[PDB]
Amino acid sequence: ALFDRLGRVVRANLNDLVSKAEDPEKVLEQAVIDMQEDLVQLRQAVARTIAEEK
Amino acid sequence: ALFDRLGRVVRANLNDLVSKAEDPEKVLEQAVIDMQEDLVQLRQAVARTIAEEK
Amino acid sequence: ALFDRLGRVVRANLNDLVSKAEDPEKVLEQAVIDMQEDLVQLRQAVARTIAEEKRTEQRLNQDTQEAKKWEDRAKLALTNGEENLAREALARKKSLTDTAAAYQTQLA
Amino acid sequence: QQRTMSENLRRNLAALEAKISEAKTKKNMLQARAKAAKANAELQQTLGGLGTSS
Amino acid sequence: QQRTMSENLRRNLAALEAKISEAKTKKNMLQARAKAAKANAELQQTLGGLGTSS
Amino acid sequence: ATSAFERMENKVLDMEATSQAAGELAGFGIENQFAQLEASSGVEDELAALKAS
């Protein structure tokens, strides 16, 4: 369908835009806050299964 | 989603800004007031459990 | 394109202007400050690669002393008689010696 | 059944924390290798400028 | 039950105070090592300036 | 942990500055051999005094 070509060009445009932006320090600080938010939410889920155990 | 790249660049910008600022004396004085506020609030929580004991 | 002829004449004008200026003493003093600025910036770049060498070497030392502290913890678990703690201390040594070997490979 | 699940979740957390902390320390190491490669690129670029000016 | 909890909280406070006070004295020690490393960097930088001026 | 990372990176910068200062003497044969000859001759003079005693 016609929407497909518009999908390819917008995917190329957003890849160019992000690629122009990306740097080592920004990805490092993002990666530590990503793992902190994943870890605290997953430890809250463990606290719910521990609460059902107790 | 598109917001992701804006998150990476703002995380890199705030890491550059804080990194430019950070010094040994400022982190030492912050670390002693942080532990004093944690300790006084936690001792107030112990005073509540002692009050329930008495 | 038309801009080409304007490029040729401005290139001729700036070559005439610099040629009229140039002298042996000015080029000598410029050449020594040029090599001093190149040398100090390049030695700062070497100081960054040396700092990464010493960073990865101190990480290797920290893991290898921590691996010996997990052998001490394994010995303490064996005198306590706690097999699950001795087996966890062995798994700590196996994994931490693998991270030590990764830091040693990077350091090599 | 809840305690065997509780230990299984503890194993899942311990494996996840190990692979996350390994991936983050290796990402910092490869970023330091990339910083050294950038310094060697600056060294060769300035050596080219020393060549043309000399 | 309240007195066994009251002693358990006393143990939690005693362990927390021990690890906080250890971490703060070690942070002061490593900051003093970093001050000595900065003094050795100034010594080598001024020795370079003595070299070029001599 | 966050303040301990700032302390750690400051001490890593002191170790890289110390390595750069040691590299300024690495392969610099005149100062390197002068320091080696001063240390070697100082030990030989101390042993010569010990043999004389």
Numbering used by the authors:
A (entry chain 0), B (entry chain 0): 2 to 55
C (entry chain 0): 2 to 109
D (entry chain 0), E (entry chain 0): 110 to 163
F (entry chain 0): 164 to 216
Copy text from the publication:
A prominent member of the PspA family is the vesicle-inducing protein in plastids 1 (Vipp1), also known as IM30 (inner membrane-associated protein of 30 kDa). Vesicle-inducing protein in plastids 1 (Vipp1) is critical for thylakoid membrane biogenesis and maintenance. Vipp1 appears to have two functions: in membrane maintenance (that is, during heat or light stress) and in thylakoid membrane (TM) biogenesis and/or remodeling.
Using single-particle-based helical reconstruction, we resolved the structures of type I tubes at 5.1-Å resolution and two structures of type II tubes at 7.0-Å and 7.1-Å resolution. The type I and II tubes differ in their diameter and the arrangement of the monomers relative to the tube axis, as well as the diameter and thickness of the engulfed lipid bilayer tube. Nevertheless, the monomer orientation among the tubes differs; in type I tubes, the α1−α3 hairpins are oriented parallel to the tube axis, while, in type II tubes, the hairpins are tilted approximately 45° relative to the tube axis. The here-determined structures of Vipp1 polymers in the presence of membranes indicated that helix α0 is immersed in the outer lipid leaflet of the bilayer. However, in contrast to SynPspA helix α0 that protrudes toward the bilayer, Vipp1 α0 lies flat in the membrane plane and appears to be partially submerged into the outer bilayer leaflet. Nevertheless, the same or similar intermolecular interactions of α0 with another α0 and α1 + α4, as observed previously in Vipp1 rings, are present in type I and II tubes.
